């Protein structure tokens, strides 16, 4: 028992972190096979970041200008290319610590772990969720760019995120491992405002099932609702609309606890309308939305 | 910016996790140098756990009864001994992945990361705090015993905890790496109730400084207090008494923000007396006490 914001073990990702320096900017790179992946804004100076033309900036850069260091040893750069907002540095040595890996572009609502890094060195690991406005509420300082987000299925690491920037509101923006930004953000020092940060309804429900499984049941009520009635309530409180796809994914949790999905929606509805009244659920005084139904099943079953 | 419940990177600890089987019980072991550390209750059967005599139980066990497997390879056991509530299995091979390490017995209020494991395999990593009642609010299922708690200083892993049991209240109990239980708990299937779980005052204050550093300032007030006045309030709300030692450790945070420690205590006092009034601090609707002043400084500076 006990329910925690758990991140994946980070060892397989630690073995891929390298430091990339270009000119006077140092950030993190991801070394997989003979390729180092890093944010293309590594080639920018402070003046360049206001309105950068990456194609023009990259012309003045050669393989020897990109300094890649893994631990205390230097990697020889034999090729460089730009793929959207990421640079791919072909090195002459394949990373001996390369795990089985995939590059996946996640959907908003999905969760992942972040290995925050500085100068190619890991500082910590935490669990995140891609917000419905395509931002992440991370913990990143200057030098953390190139830190990656990932999920693990037994031995395979699915890289889903690479950190690029902090918006003026302190929230974070970045790309998948193909260089495409999540959301409408661009890698430029310009004010870009985030859209409405709605709550991930299916995740809150999965977390409510995790609470029932672990003993916290006070919020269970004698009511039920319909998908349309629930969604009227969800709209009012800036919750994501729940679909039958979301109900389908909650199926294993509904089966284990014996509480029908719509019954849990009615409990969630009363919680939205009345609040917690000074009480807590899983040691939290607010409704947690950064546990997917898969994370709840994984944690409550002990998947390694 | 952004403030997250961050765990240490777990790679160095993943390389030490092994599976230990004795008879029909399988749990986790920690392989450092040529020694495997695991909970001594691995030698117990269900009937034994009610009132076990570990010295008597250990007499009927030989080196060959302890099956140690690291990944898919078997370790040869050449010695076994009991040190308090942990068994030390001398193996003929030193762990090639042994990091620089120390065994430390932490004080309540101190935080650490837990690499939850099942069958010698890591499932996840989360941040914990040793509660003032010597329990931990973890996330552990059957098979997770032997999972360890640790902190990291650059390259040195300080092992501070080894998981042993779940109390009937769903909270967790365990030992330091010398086999001594934190608190008054014994490794026996008997009801053992936890003491008052007070809030770690110095940690809440450190988290309030982290909130000011990251933009959340609404809770700052025009008041101040004294250590004795604050402690009257802290006693009422089951908060740990604050000492000048705690004030000393908050010094770097007080210096960075320019908010005197006692001024922050007055803000905390008003928060205890009035509540959050539906507001949040660092995305939390309750006062977080599992960030030490050291964790706040580390995260807010980017220590790797
Ligand atoms: C200062 C900081 C903190 C956290 N995360 C990231 C950063 N860095 C940035 O946001 C910088 C590089 C960005 C360029 C437009 C691409 C501006
Ligand atoms: C079932 C479980 C779940 C989480 N953590 C731990 C456990 N296991 C236990 O508490 C068992 C082994 C204990 C023996 C008295 C020493 C009883």
- Cross-chain Cβ contact A280/B286 below 8 Å: yes
SS3 A297: helix
Which residues, in sequence order, are CB contacts of B85 under 8 Å at separation 6+? B39, B40, B41, B164, B175, B179, B180, B181, B187
Three-class DSSP category at B168 = coil
Give dist(CA A43, CA A62) in Å, integer: 11
Residue A208 sits in the same domain as residue A291: yes
Residue B46 has which token pair? 């269900």
Of B99, B129, B156, which marks where a domain is finished? B99
B72 and B146 share one domain: no
Cβ-contact A166, A140 below 8 angstroms: yes
What technique was this entry resolved by?
X-ray
B166 lines ligand 2 (CB under 6 A): yes
Burial of B105 (0-12, 13-18, 19+ CB in 10 A): middle
> Would an 8 Å CB–CB cutoff place B215 in contact with chain A?
yes
- Which pair of tokens denotes residue A174? 């970045």
Residue range(s) defining the domain that contains residue A51: 15-99
Q: Is the CB of B93 under 6 A from ligand 2?
A: no
B124 has a chain A CB within 8 A of its CB: yes
Q: Which residues pair with A91 in a beta bridge?
A: A77
Distance CA A64, CA B63 (A): 57
If asked whether residues A137 and A203 sit together in one domain, one would say no
For B275, the closest chain A residue by CA position comes to A278
**Quick one: tokens of A89?**
């540095």
Q: Which of B215, B206, B198, B200 is nearest to B283 (CA)?
A: B215
Is A163 known to be catalytic?
Answer: no
Resolution of this PDB entry, in A? 1.8
Contact B225, B269 (CB under 8 A): yes
Based on the fold, state whether residues B171 and B39 are members of the same structural domain.
Answer: no
- Known active-site residue A41: yes
B7 plus B120 within the same structural domain:
yes
Q: Please report the residues numbered 144 through 173 in chain A whose beta carbons come closer than 8 angstroms to any beta carbon of chain B.
A: 144, 166, 170-172
Q: How many domains does chain A contain in total?
A: 3
A187 lines ligand 1 (CB under 6 A): yes
The values of phi and psi at residue B54, to 5°, are: -55, -35
* Bridge partners, B90 (sequence order): B35, B79
CA distance B268 to B260: 13
Residue A58 Cα distances to A40, A42, A175, angstroms: 9, 10, 19
Distances (CA, A) of B199 to B217, B237, B246: 22, 8, 14
The 3-class SS string of B57-107 reads HHHCCCHHHEEEEECCEEECEEEEEEECCEEEEEECCCCCCCCEEEECCCC
* A1: CATH: 2.40.10.10
Contacts of B61 (CB under 8 A, 6+ apart): B22, B43, B80
Angle, vertex CA A137, rays to CA A161 and CA A211, nearest 5? 100
Contact (CB<8Å) B285/A284: yes
Please say whether the beta carbons of B304 and A117 come within 8 A. Answer: yes
What distance in Å separates the CA atoms of residue A71 and residue A78, rounded to the nearest whole number?
Answer: 19
Residue A191 and residue A106 in one domain: yes
Dihedral angle sign, alpha carbons of residues B197, B202, B203, B207: positive
In the block, residue with structure tokens 């302890």? B66
- Exposure b/e, A27-64, CB count within 10 A at least 16 = b: bbbbbbebbbbbbbbbbbeeebeeebebeebeeeeeee
Kindly report the backbone phi and psi dihedral angles of residue B122, in degrees, each rounded to the nearest multiple of 5, phi listed first: -70, 135
Q: Do B191 and B241 fall into the same domain?
A: no
Are the C-beta atoms of residues A31 and A18 closer than 8 Å to each other? Answer: yes
CA distance B298 to B47: 47
Token pair belonging to B163: 């998981």
- Residues in Cβ contact with A153 at an 8 Å cutoff, skipping those fewer than 6 apart: none
Nearest to A128 by CA among A149, A98, A142: A149
Q: Which residues pair with B29 in a beta bridge?
A: B18
Catalytic residue among A22, A85, A145, A265: A145
Give the torsion sign (CA, A238, A185, B298, B105). Answer: positive
Same-domain status, B273 and B205:
yes
**Residue B111 DSSP SS3:** strand
Residues B204 and B282 in one domain: yes
Does residue B10 sit in the same domain as residue B131? yes
Structure tokens at A251: 């199926």
Active site residues of B: 41, 145
Measure Cα distances from A304 to A19, A122, B127, B191 in Å. Answer: 30, 22, 18, 30
Paired residues of A77 in beta bridges = A91
Q: What is the CATH number of the domain that holds A207?
A: 1.10.1840.10
Candidates A3, A170, A303; nearest CB to B123: A303
Q: Report the separation in Å between the CA atom of B289 and the middle of ligand 2, taken as the mean of its atom positions.
A: 26
Asked if residues B17 and B29 have their Cβ atoms less than 8 Å apart, the reply is: yes
Any ligand 1 atom below 6 A from CB of A175 = no
Enclosing H/E stretch for B113: strand B111-118
d(CA A26, CA A36): 14
Sheet with B25-32, side-by-side order of all strands: B73-75, B66-70, B17-22, B25-32, B35-39, B86-91, B77-83
Q: Which of B163, B197, B231 is the last residue of a domain?
A: B197
Let me know if B256 is exposed, middle or buried by CB neighbors in 10 A (0-12, 13-18, 19+). Answer: middle
Joined tokens for residue A289: 């939305």
Task: Please list every residue in chain B followed by a chain break, i.e. its C lies more than 2.5 Å from the next written N.
Answer: none
């Amino acid at each position: 028992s006990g329910f925690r914001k758990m991140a994946f073990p980070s060892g397989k990702v630690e073995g891929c972190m390298v430091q990339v320096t270009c000119g006077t900017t140092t950030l993190n790179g991801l070394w997989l096979d003979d390729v180092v992946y890093c944010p293309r804004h590594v080639i920018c100076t402070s003046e360049d970041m206001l309105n950068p033309n990456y194609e023009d900036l990259l012309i003045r850069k050669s393989n020897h200008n990109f300094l890649v260091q893994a631990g205390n040893v230097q990697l020889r750069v034999i090729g460089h290319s730009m793929q959207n907002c990421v640079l791919k540095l072909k090195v002459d040595t394949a990373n001996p610590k390369t795990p089985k890996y995939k590059f996946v572009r996640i959907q908003p609502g999905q969760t992942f772990s972040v290995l925050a890094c500085y100068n190619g060195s890991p500082s910590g690991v935490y669990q995140c969720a891609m917000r419905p406005n395509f931002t992440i509420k991370g913990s990143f300082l200057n030098g953390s760019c190139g830190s990656v987000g990932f999920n693990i299925d037994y031995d395979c690491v699915s890289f889903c995120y690479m950190h690029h920037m902090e918006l003026p509101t302190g929230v974070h923006a970045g790309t998948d491992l193909e260089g495409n930004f999540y959301g409408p953000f661009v890698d430029r020092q310009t004010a870009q405002a985030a859209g409405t940060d709605t709550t991930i309804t299916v995740n809150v429900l999965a977390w409510l099932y995790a609470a029932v499984i672990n003993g916290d049941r006070w919020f269970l009520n004698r009511f039920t609702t319909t998908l349309n009635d629930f969604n009227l309530v969800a709209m009012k409180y800036n919750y994501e609309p729940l679909t039958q796809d979301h109900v389908d994914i909650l199926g294993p949790l509904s089966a284990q606890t014996g509480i029908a999905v719509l019954d849990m929606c009615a409990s969630l509805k009363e919680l939205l309308q009345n609040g917690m009244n000074g009480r807590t659920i899983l040691g939290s005084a607010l409704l947690e939305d950064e546990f997917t139904p898969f994370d709840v099943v994984r944690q409550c079953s002990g998947v390694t």
